[PDB]
Amino acid sequence: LSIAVFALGCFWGPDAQFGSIKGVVSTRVGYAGGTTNNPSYYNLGDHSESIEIQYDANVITYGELLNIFWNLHNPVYETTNRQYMSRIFYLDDGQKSEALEMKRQIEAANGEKIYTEIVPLENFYLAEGYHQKY
Amino acid sequence: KLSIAVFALGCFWGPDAQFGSIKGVVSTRVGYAGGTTNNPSYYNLGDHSESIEIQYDANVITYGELLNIFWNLHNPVYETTNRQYMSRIFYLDDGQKSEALEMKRQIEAANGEKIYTEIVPLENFYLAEGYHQKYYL
């Protein structure tokens, strides 16, 4: 086969991953709950670092996105910690239906338990930049 | 009017400054522990964080004295999810477990504030890079 070798450096990109997809028009990093009150960077409670993906469903579907999401990480570890967990926050019953569905597939396909949690999007805070001091 | 200095000191220097020159402590090694993944690496730590292995001579210093040093080095009275404010004791046997729990309760009783230090069993410990374990490629 052929071989390419690239170094990305530091100026990427948990959002750049999804942003590079055909049909997603913008992405924002944010913190998604979860119903813990008053999350902070010091204590996120049940909120998780998340990507809000605004996409044109005439170009990609929610199931195609689901597919790339699952190929972009390896959620085969038991972990209680909301912050290290693979999570899907559904916005409707359809997304949820679709997300439970493909999870079942993948688990069969390989046998492994997949630990992605399916929970409704109840809160979403944009990420704040750190305050500069002068 | 006060004056300002700004310094950067890497995290892995801390262990030897915190415990290294304590009488009875023979060595300290920085590592990674407390996560899930079978093999963290320089490129991805998974859910592990900075931990320290302290080798000590019990005829000189006790585990209790080390716990007192650990709790004199920080003030874990706020719930946190943040790795930079981690407070964790990894007990190697039930003797260490019970000494850590008993001292935690004593601190809580004496100062009136819940202590958010987690006391959990040591399962795996990975040796991290250092000036005496450079990990030459």
Specify the amino acid at residue B68.
Answer: N
How far apart are the C-alpha atoms of B59 and B62, rounded to whole Å? 8
The DSSP code for A92 is S
**B25-33 β-sheet, strand order:** B49-56, B25-33, B125-127
Q: What are the b/e assignments for B15-35, b being 16+ CB within 10 Å?
A: bbebbeeeeebeebbbbbbbb
- A83 interfacial to chain B (CB closer than 8 Å): yes
Alpha-carbon distance of B27 to B57, in angstroms, equals 10
DSSP state of A84: T
How far is the C-alpha of A77 from the C-alpha of A102, rounded, in Å? Answer: 18
Instruction: For residue B57, report the phi and psi dihedrals to the nearest 5 degrees.
Output: -105, 110
Asked whether the CA dihedral A15, A16, A18, A19 is positive or negative, the reply is positive
Give the count of beta carbons closer than 10 Å to the beta carbon of residue A39.
19
In chain A, beta strands by DSSP E:
24-33, 48-55, 87-90, 117-120, 123-126
Interface test mutation site (partner A, options B32, B36, B81, max chain A beta carbons within 10 A): B81
Shortest alpha-carbon distance between residue A40 and chain B (Å): 9
Chain A residues whose CB is inside 8 A of the B84 CB are none
CATH, domain B1-137, list 3.90.1150.10, 3.30.160.70, 3.30.1060.10, 1.25.40.10: 3.30.1060.10
Q: Does B37 touch chain A (CB under 8 A)?
A: yes
Q: Are strands A117-120 and A87-90 parallel, antiparallel or unpaired?
A: parallel
- Rounded to an integer, what distance in angstroms lies between the CA atom of residue B122 and that of residue A92? 42
Find chain B residues with C-beta within 8 A of A83's C-beta. 81
B81 touching A, CB under 8 A?
yes
Intra-chain end-to-end CA distance of chain B, in Å: 50
Architecture of domain A1-134: 2-Layer Sandwich (3.30)
**Chain position carrying tokens 């220097």:** B13
> Which of B3, B11, B17, B107 is flagged as catalytic?
B11
DSSP one-letter code for B12: G
Domain ranges of chain B: 1-137
Q: Resolution in angstroms for this experimental structure?
A: 1.8
Is A42 in Cβ contact with B80 (below 8 Å)?
Answer: yes
> Which residue spans within A56-131 are E strands per DSSP?
87-90, 117-120, 123-126
Chain Cα centroid distance, residue B4: 29
d(CA A36, CA A52): 19
Determined by which method? X-ray
Query: In B109-119, which positions are buried (b, 16+ CB within 10 angstroms) versus exposed (e)?
Result: eeeeeebebeb
